[PDB]
Amino acid sequence: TTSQKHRDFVAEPMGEKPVGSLAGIGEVLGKKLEERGFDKAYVVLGQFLVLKKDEDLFREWLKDTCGANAKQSRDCFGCLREWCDAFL
Amino acid sequence: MTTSQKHRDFVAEPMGEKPVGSLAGIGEVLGKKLEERGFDKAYVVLGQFLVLKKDEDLFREWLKDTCGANAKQSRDCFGCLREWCDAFL
Numbered sequence: 001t002t003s004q005k006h007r008d009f010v011a012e013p014m015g016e017k018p019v020g021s022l023a024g025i026g027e028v029l030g031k032k033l034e035e036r037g038f039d040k041a042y043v044v045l046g047q048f049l050v051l052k053k054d055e056d057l058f059r060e061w062l063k064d065t066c067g068a069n070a071k072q073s074r075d076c077f078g079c080l081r082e083w084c085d086a087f088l
Numbered sequence: 089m090t091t092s093q094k095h096r097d098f099v100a101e102p103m104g105e106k107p108v109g110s111l112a113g114i115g116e117v118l119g120k121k122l123e124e125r126g127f128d129k130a131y132v133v134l135g136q137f138l139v140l141k142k143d144e145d146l147f148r149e150w151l152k153d154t155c156g157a158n159a160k161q162s163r164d165c166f167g168c169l170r171e172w173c174d175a176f177l
Binding site: 013014015037040042043045046047048049050052084087088 | 103135140173176
């Protein structure tokens with residue numbers, strides 16, 4: 001199952017969308033990401049790609065960086081993976 | 089058109105699993121050094137470009153530090169990723 005936020009994100013180029021457009025990334029997680037330099041969705045895409053799309057390493061990085069729980073990191077990973085399948 | 093045919097072929101379509109050598113400015117010598125440092129697919133270099141927030145100075149310096157690229161090579165590589173992003177990101 002997936003949220004509408006996921007489906008909205010995977011359907012279109014992300015351009016300059018903020019980090020909060022990513023599935024799983026709510027207001028709390030977004031503030032922390034912004035505070036650490038990840039202010040737009042594409043910067044988080046960048047990390048996903050530097051980590052060679054590795055699910056375990058990306059979800060752990062998201063936990064260490066902004067405190068995402070398992071569901072939140074699962075949803076964020078899945079939205080980036082499906083976005084890449086469509087556009088990359 | 090003053091770009092390389094490599095640039096044009098790269099920016100014309102999604103990059104998928106293209107090797108790092110498909111990037112403009114990345115010949116066999118630079119490509120090997122990038123591959124040895126774990127940057128084996130073009131999208132991994134895109135990743136670094138994006139984590140650096142598309143900053144030319146930071147990205148070109150990273151490329152120089154990582155594979156020894158010269159100014160022309162690093163400018164070609166940045167320009168190709170910049171225009172790819174403008175087209176597809």
